[PDB]
Design the sequence.
């Protein structure tokens, strides 16, 4: 049943139209409809994100991760994620391939099961549906 | 009146001749002379720096930012700064163009109003004077 | 007598055969045999690692540093380490030259006294022995 949705730096600033709290609500509702339980967490702290990934590794739970800027920069986060035995779906709200070159490189994509970008907040919901059907 | 001066990693080690406390004193005095209030904050924690940038975004206040090593490495910090509606002045005490190649690239400069480097601690004071006259 | 052994992100996950606690035990025992005192610390937080490096700088104590993913990414950590007056030995358990290209670049190596990689946990013990004989 359990899927961990982990949001990284700046994701708490969503909507300041959809706020981060509203995103949590949308994800939780969709998870319920799919027979899952979504646990949604956000932090601007890499160490906090690492701890949540460690917990998912210990629990053998899947992760939907939007790491924000750390996607492009953090080897530590990638390496934490490499311990996950369950699927890892990388999500970006924006199309990271449509702006600065540096955003087109992700440390996470090579070790993720898959990646969804540019489909807005629905990307999280589509990631949930992937996990439900697998 | 209010200008946020935000110092990143290692800036607390200044003078260990001018210490970070002495830098705060110099900035506060100059701000007073210019009819401004400077709020000076330093942290080695990226998450703390992000929170201070978020607060400046919410308050529509300008920021003078010396991000230390994060200047060259942090997309998360750049992205937080992109939310600022008021001016962002990037400051470096040292001339970052006169040593290692990696220091000559800043994630902040492309989104800053302007950048002052190599003028020592006076760089902060000159940034204050820019904001006062604008 | 005192050598600071500082472990960065993900090192707390060792053995989850040798756990991080067992690594601490092995290092402490070897330090004792060499007439040293090893102080072993681990954190997933860059800010915490920076504080431990600052303390070693203030105490003029040597550092054996395995920075984990931050080895490849953190200018802030490198810059903190540049304040150290005593030796800095960079250690990696794995051979960082035998996998992804990005692991073959270290911000720490150019400012370290030396570097040991790929010799497993014994790398820490060999670093201790270097410091003991110098
Ligand atoms: O597309 C993403 O999900 C992304 O992982 C791309 C990543 O390159 C960037 O650091 C980021 O962080 C930069 C941000 C921009 C922004 C705009 C409006 C409200 C909040 C935020 S946070 C985000 C996260 C995004 C969320 C929404 C659009 S991008
Ligand atoms: O020039 C800067 O302001 C800079 O943002 C350049 C940046 O590349 C570097 O990570 C850093 O951080 C490296 C440091 C060096 C140093 C030397 C003496 C006392 C404190 C510090 S902290 C600094 C910050 C600087 C402050 C003073 C000189 S450079
Ligand atoms: O070789 C190292 O010491 C290294 O600094 C290499 C570095 O590139 C990597 O981020 C890391 O962090 C990735 C990790 C992998 C792993 C595997 C088994 C148990 C724990 C960990 S943590 C480590 C630290 C390592 C420890 C053991 C093997 S690599």
Sequence:
């Amino acid at each position: 049943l359990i899927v961990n949705v982990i949001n990284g730096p700046n994701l708490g600033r969503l909507g300041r139209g959809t706020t981060h709290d509203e995103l949590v609500a949308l994800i939780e509702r969709e998870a319920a409809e799919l027979g899952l339980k979504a646990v949604v967490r956000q932090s601007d702290s890499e160490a906090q994100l690492l701890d949540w990934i460690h917990q998912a590794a210990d629990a053998a739970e899947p992760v939907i991760l939007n790491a924000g800027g750390l996607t492009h920069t953090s080897v530590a986060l990638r390496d934490a994620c490499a311990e996950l035995s369950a699927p890892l779906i990388e999500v970006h709200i924006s199309n990271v391939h449509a702006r600065e070159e540096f955003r087109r490189h992700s440390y996470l994509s090579p070790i993720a099961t898959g990646v969804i970008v540019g489909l807005g907040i629905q990307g999280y919901l589509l990631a949930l549906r992937y996990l439900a059907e697998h």
Observations:
- Chain C has one domain: 1-134.
- Residues 20-33 of chain C form the longest helix (14 residues).
- Residues 1-134 of chain C form a domain with the Rossmann fold fold (CATH 3.40.50.9100).
